[PDB]
């Protein structure tokens, strides 16, 4: 899958990178993902750029929101995304990533959407399973 | 929805906040989502890292143009989707941003596929209609 | 098609013009798509905040990855899609982007999911076929 953490820059690059792993650990945890199956890009932004509110739940976030979009092979189920959003969140509180300021998403296309380089489609050919 | 708007450093900051302000207006005016379900992500760059042409359609554009990006689950008509576009760029004429120089993508998931912070999905949960 | 390029800080802005061009060109062979239809949004990162690895696949990488993200509509089929994988590769690698560096994604919507400018659907109208 390909993760896009869209992040703020008041955020210190240790903590990045600690906020990439984690994403990244909880989606082997879940998914079962091979461990070199990882693709992301980490954007940090002034925190005026990310505007994220509460869609009316009754709670504030910080202005250090971090914006999680999976990109991912359509499959999974309701209750396996459920564990995503479970895993990923928790994996970031030790980290120091508070509950309320993860939002997430996924958007899912299929196998033969990706090439993983060589302007090969290894779903399709069958180098990846 | 969560948007994706990518837009270029000659806009001011002001001028930023005007154009996200008038792009979740308009969503919230068509579309009548709740004012609080206000996701956006802008990100500005030189105007040469935004290469948007006309599609053949014989008009030009400034190089100031803004790519507004729709990540909102399925469910809405074709209809209500023109009713969209139409807001929008109505929305950003009186701030500066002329017809010409605006784009807008759409792009579909299910509601299962939204975590709005702590680890949940509040369609799944039903915490939110 | 809406096509995001990530790719990293140290590239010299001639090779992302040039990476740009040549995606661009790669698109309008496979896809026999308008020239005029390009819309492309180049983002250069801090190298360390993109992160491509293999799946696995047992191949390194430099930094200097280049990941494209195709937004296309509905239609094409599997051998298309393989098609453009191919033609992306081999034009980018005469402009000093190897095969082991590109990695590429398509997620697919639908005709009424544009707008080219103006506030209009062009598809829909029937402006554009």
Known sequence: P???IDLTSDRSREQRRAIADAVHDALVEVLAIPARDRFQILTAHDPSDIIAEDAGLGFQRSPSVVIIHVFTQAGRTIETKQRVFAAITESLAPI???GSDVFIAIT?????????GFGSAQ???GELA
Chains 1, 2, 3 share one sequence.
């Open 108 to 116: 899912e296309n299929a196998p033969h959407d990706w090439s993983f």
């Open 96 to 98: 120091g990533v508070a």
């Open 123 to 125: 779903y399709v050919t």
């Open 2 to 4: 390909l993760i896009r």
